[PDB]
Ligand binder design. Structure first.
Ligand SMILES: *[C@@H]1O[C@H](CO)[C@@H](O)[C@H](O)[C@H]1NC(C)=O
Ligand SMILES: *[C@@H]1O[C@H](CO)[C@@H](O)[C@H](O)[C@H]1NC(C)=O
Lengths: 15, 184, 185
């Protein structure tokens, strides 16, 4: 059916 | 924080010759400034600005976090392109609408509502490709997945004058042509 | 500076504070694939037909804004950086198709050099706010990290009318009104 789109994953900078 | 700040992140996938070649950049931007970034060519996170040093090392210091990122070139770019994009973006073909209207007068050929961006418009006077006295607007992005371009021909309407706007676009199996005579 | 046949921006997360204002979108060759409505948690495709062939889990957009919001909080505290200047937006109005009296058309209001991405773009027909037949795009990113956005007004060309794209932005010391009329011709 529908072809899913994946996205980049922003990384968390330590607090 | 009492002051307004803008943070922006994005994952850019540069394709050339299809997926044959794929460069992948990840950009972290703060207050209009890119501070840290991951380039597939560099292989790892780099501090674009000084404020980014802490983070470049920090993320490069987390094997899967840094190994998931390198994989996004395949997880995201290659995957989005070879799948979804081929069924939508890469196959959208909108046939340009073409019309000529007057403006020592000027002929204006309106080429509108087409997609993709690639296009070549040419003027002909008596089957001969006119090049002087011709000028085009830049490519105009309508923001709704269509473009337009206006091409003008400065001329002197000589009785027996046949002016043809010639448009070649991928959505067109056969180049479009619209003709205008001093008569019309 | 980086050349290619195609550019797929898969994931653009914009976040602003104070206000928790977020925007998540996908772009391809400079056009908007879709934006994730952060409140309704829904992927909204600019082209309805594209939404029937491909899909996107709005969660990914939500995760993105989550991280981006965190990072900002860190940077806003890790730095003493001064807030960037409110740029003055610039608007241009032009018709989608060649104008033809009495034939339905679309007026397009292209607004560039928008920063920060907080703005009110409204339409006026004869100095009166038009509510119907108006559509707006998401904030598109620019190479200089400012943004642009377009608004569309569906209309019937007539020389008796004068239109106005009204832009309100912090960087303008008064609402800017770009005028347009088929009568200029
Ligand atoms: C691009 O075209 C094909 C894509 O499969 C590839 O085999 C070829 O090497 C490339 N040619 C170039 C360098 O333009
Ligand atoms: C946008 O319009 C609203 C009214 O809906 C107003 O309260 C706000 O101040 C405007 N924002 C600006 C000046 O950009």
């Amino acid at each position: 059916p529908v072809s899913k789109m994946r996205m980049a994953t922003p990384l968390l900078m330590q607090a | 924080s009492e002051r307004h700040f803008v943070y922006q992140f994005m994952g850019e996938c540069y394709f050339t010759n299809g997926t044959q070649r794929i460069r992948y950049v990840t950009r972290y931007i703060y207050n209009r400034e890119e501070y840290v970034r991951y380039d597939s060519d560099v292989g790892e996170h780099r501090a674009v600005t000084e404020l980014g040093r802490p983070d470049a090392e920090y993320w490069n210091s987390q094997p899967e976090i840094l190994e998931r990122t390198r994989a996004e070139l395949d997880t995201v770019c290659r995957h989005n392109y070879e799948g979804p994009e081929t069924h939508t973006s890469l196959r959208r073909l909108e046939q340009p609408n073409v019309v000529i209207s007057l403006s020592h007068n000027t002929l204006v050929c309106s080429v509108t509502d087409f997609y993709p961006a690639k296009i070549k418009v040419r003027w002909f006077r008596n089957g001969q490709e006119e090049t002087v006295g011709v000028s085009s607007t830049q490519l105009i992005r309508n923001g709704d997945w269509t473009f337009q371009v206006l091409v003008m021909l400065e001329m002197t309407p000589r009785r027996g004058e046949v002016y043809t706007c010639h448009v070649e676009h991928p959505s067109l199996k056969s180049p479009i042509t619209v003709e205008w005579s001093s008569a019309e | 500076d980086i050349e290619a046949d195609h550019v797929g921006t898969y994931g653009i997360s914009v976040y602003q504070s104070p206000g928790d204002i977020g925007q998540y979108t996908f772009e391809f060759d400079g056009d908007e694939l879709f934006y994730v409505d952060l409140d309704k948690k829904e992927t909204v495709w600019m082209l309805p037909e594209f939404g029937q062939l491909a899909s996107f889990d709005p969660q990914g957009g939500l995760q993105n804004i989550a991280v981006v919001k965190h990072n900002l909080g860190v940077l806003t505290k890790r730095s003493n950086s001064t807030p960037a200047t409110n740029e003055a937006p610039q608007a241009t109005v032009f018709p989608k198709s060649p104008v033809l009296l009495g034939q339905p058309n679309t007026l397009i209001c292209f607004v560039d050099n928008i920063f920060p991405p907080v703005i009110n773009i409204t339409w006026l027909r004869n100095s009166k706010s038009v509510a119907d037949g108006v559509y707006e795009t998401s904030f598109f990113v620019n190479r200089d990290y400012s943004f642009h956005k377009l608004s569309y007004l569906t209309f019937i060309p007539s020389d008796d009318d004068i239109y106005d794209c009204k832009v309100e932005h912090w960087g303008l010391e008064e609402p800017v009104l770009k005028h347009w009329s088929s009568a200029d011709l």
